[PDB]
Amino acid sequence: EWTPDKLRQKLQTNAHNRLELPLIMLSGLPDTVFEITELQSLKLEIIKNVMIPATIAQLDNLQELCLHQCSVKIHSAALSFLKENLKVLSVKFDDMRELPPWMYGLRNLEELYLVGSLSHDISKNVTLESLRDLKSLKILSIKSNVSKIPQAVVDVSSHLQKMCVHNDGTKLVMLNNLKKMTNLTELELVHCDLERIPHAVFSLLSLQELDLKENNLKSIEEIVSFQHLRKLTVLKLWYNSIAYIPEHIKKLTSLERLFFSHNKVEVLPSHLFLCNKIRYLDLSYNDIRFIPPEIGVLQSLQYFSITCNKVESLPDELYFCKKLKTLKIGKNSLSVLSPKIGNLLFLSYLDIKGNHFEVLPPELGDCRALKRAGLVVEDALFETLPSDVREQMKAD
Amino acid sequence: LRQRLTKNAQDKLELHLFMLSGIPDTVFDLVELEVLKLELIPDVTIPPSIAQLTGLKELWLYHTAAKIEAPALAFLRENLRALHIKFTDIKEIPLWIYSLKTLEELHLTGNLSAENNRYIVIDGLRELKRLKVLRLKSNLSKLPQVVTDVGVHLQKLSINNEGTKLIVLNSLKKMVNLTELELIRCDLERIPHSIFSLHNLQEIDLKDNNLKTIEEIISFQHLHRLTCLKLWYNHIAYIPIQIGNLTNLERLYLNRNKIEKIPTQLFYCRKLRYLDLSHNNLTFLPADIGLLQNLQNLAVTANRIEALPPELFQCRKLRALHLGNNVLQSLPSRVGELTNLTQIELRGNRLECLPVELGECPLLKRSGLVVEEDLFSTLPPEVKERLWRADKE
């Protein structure tokens, strides 16, 4: 049925920029798969009871597998070859049998994407506790209900660099495992049902990027020990219910990426602006009433998204900072736009859609890095501009 | 058969006959067919109805023991011009291939080296006169004397031994008409001097020859016509400065090597157009890349380059900037000055956000701009509308 020509014309690329075969709705693998030796990945979607032959040895370029609802078996020499060749895996398990026990037998694994539906009996998974066999595993994305962190995660404490969980409404407990992370750099706890910051997250000592998205954090209080995360530059805390940012964020002087958008903060603090190292500050769709005038310290800020907030008064101190490149104030509560905007030499993004304005000043022509495609304004207010001012951003 | 017709890389009409009892006569009734592909056809005879196959120019023989009719033999003598022969046994090759006179491209893939059949079977390629392309994926321990006899008219010698070293013995001096030499997977471990004795070569490929050192290239100025030095898939850990003497290079394929630093002398060559240094150990990119104005596709995929210098965007002819799988922290806005850019690869990088000026490139589209979806979302929805429209329009 599946000639090699059909598989050659089936060939395409995946989300990881690899040559992937999306084998979907089949009974097994064809033997003409292995004639395409240039393949780098196979997407097996709902192909159960599959026995992989040794002819996979012809797939020298293969470095990725993506098993989607497939209860696949492998043969011994094929197992050895994929042990000596494979780097990336991504297995989804709608049913437990669809997760294969053979896949942990490799040792050259770097990246793993363990999406699926794990049972709450997590510590009983000896198949999980075989990730200690993997001597190069650095990316571990478990999109499943991980209530209690496995000791499988303990066994890969050092070699791991990216740790991702989508717990999907289950509380993340047994914190001593995440205390045992030594060389982990990227902790991505997306929707782990964290009622606050866990003490495990704070016992990290080598973190660089922390994401607590969709985690109902109550406060950011323990920050007296975030100073030990001098390696941290990325703080991802948006789509949350945080209502305030205390002064304690001054502890980290290496913070660059700060996310606080879609939060319950009603007034932005000035002591948040006291830190000047912060280059990325995201606060879109917040409830901020006004910006205190201490934001002038934030000179290195290249991203201040205050768009779709409740902000009615914008101080002139923010326009003193000229390094702000990506600035979005769209759908805000402003009344007039500040004439002094020309000092922002590096300003590519300006978004003012939805916000009520009386008359667009000619000083919008004073922006140098602004572009007409970068200046998202309505057609009616596009008409309310001088022709030279129109051409200033329209003509490249 | 009409719906079975396809097209090859050479834009010729194609027909792949795989695992049939014989060969259909309705295949031979076709007139628009150009390349017929005989794969795994056990012991068939070619009917003279090949007189209908006037556009037929490439006979592809894969494991096919073919017997031949005399009028069809004459027709193939006067029409057929490209024959590819793959065989498992040295008796599987047809003996009427020597009677072909219009044949110029031959692809003898499969072991020609056997006891008392080592190049004695193909000793009949002396009868071949117009042969210019001779691909040999045949595990040759030593290069034949028969190609030393033939190479006066040969113009391309692609030898794949799949792991067997050639004892060249400078025997290419009698082979003076080569314009291309593709020594692939030969495990040479050194560049021999036969390529150096030649003068007419313009495309030199030394793929997977385990070239640890390439210090000989100082003499490559003697080769005044070389334009594509494909020194890829080797063990090259550094580039000697005498490559600066090679001003005639246009494509320098050094990808999948162990080179960790580019000397600035390599950056003297103004004629470089395809600087592919992907899958290497480069940690920084020198600014002198702005001097290389003729560069079009700079592929530094899967390197250690953390920051692109602004001088990289001095060269306005960059058509395909393959920056994927690198450690690029941020891409500077000077890419908005580039116009020839058609496909830029940024997925798999440390890129924090996509700058707005990336939308300034006219010919760039979504298929060209391959990037992670969240990285795509960082562009303004009006700029994102422009790029999505370039996908649409």
From Swiss-Prot, chain A:
Heterohexamer; oligomerizes with other LRRC8 proteins (LRRC8A, LRRC8B, LRRC8D and/or LRRC8E) to form a heterohexamer. Homoheptamer; inactive, likely because it is not targeted to the plasma membrane in the absence of LRRC8A. In vivo, the subunit composition may depend primarily on expression levels, and heterooligomeric channels containing various proportions of the different LRRC8 proteins may coexist. Induction: Induced during the earliest stages of adipogenesis. This is Volume-regulated anion channel subunit LRRC8C. Non-essential component of the volume-regulated anion channel (VRAC, also named VSOAC channel), an anion channel required to maintain a constant cell volume in response to extracellular or intracellular osmotic changes. The VRAC channel conducts iodide better than chloride and can also conduct organic osmolytes like taurine. Plays a redundant role in the efflux of amino acids, such as aspartate and glutamate, in response to osmotic stress. LRR repeats lie at residues 2-13, 14-36, 39-59, 60-81, 83-106, 108-130, 134-156, 159-179, 181-204, 206-228, 230-252, 253-275, 277-298, 299-321, 323-344, 345-367, 369-392. Expressed at very low levels in adipose tissue. Residues 1-396 are cytoplasmic. It is found in: Cell membrane; Endoplasmic reticulum membrane. The gene is Lrrc8c. Belongs to the LRRC8 family. The volume-regulated anion channel (VRAC) channel forms a trimer of dimers, with symmetry mismatch between the pore-forming domain and the cytosolic LRR repeats, a topology similar to gap junction proteins. Disruption phenotype: Mice do not show remarkable changes in body weight or the weight of white adipose tissue on a chow diet, but display significantly lower body weights and fat mass than wild-type mice when fed a high-fat diet. Moreover, improved insulin resistance induced by the high-fat diet is observed.
UniProtKB/Swiss-Prot annotation, chain B:
The gene is Lrrc8a. Disruption phenotype: Increased prenatal and postnatal mortality, growth retardation, and multiple tissue abnormalities. B-cell development is slightly impaired, without affecting B-cell function. Mice however show a cell-autonomous early block in thymocyte development and impairs peripheral T-cell expansion and function. Conditional deletion in germ cells leads to abnormal sperm and male infertility: the cytoplasm of late spermatids appears swollen, preventing reduction of the cytoplasm during further development into spermatozoa. Residues 1-393 are cytoplasmic. The chain holds residues 416 to 808 of 810 of the full protein. It comes from the Eukaryota. Heterohexamer; oligomerizes with other LRRC8 proteins (LRRC8B, LRRC8C, LRRC8D and/or LRRC8E) to form a heterohexamer. Can form homohexamers in vitro, but these have lower conductance than heterohexamers. In vivo, the subunit composition may depend primarily on expression levels, and heterooligomeric channels containing various proportions of the different LRRC8 proteins may coexist. Interact with GRB2. Interacts with NOX4; this interaction prevents the ubiquitin-mediated degradation of LRRC8A. The volume-regulated anion channel (VRAC) channel forms a trimer of dimers, with symmetry mismatch between the pore-forming domain and the cytosolic LRR repeats, a topology similar to gap junction proteins. This is Volume-regulated anion channel subunit LRRC8A. LRR repeats lie at residues 8-30, 32-53, 54-77, 78-100, 103-127, 128-150, 152-174, 175-198, 199-222, 224-246, 247-269, 271-292, 293-315, 317-338, 339-361, 363-386. Belongs to the LRRC8 family. A motif (Di-leucine motif) lies at residues 291-292.
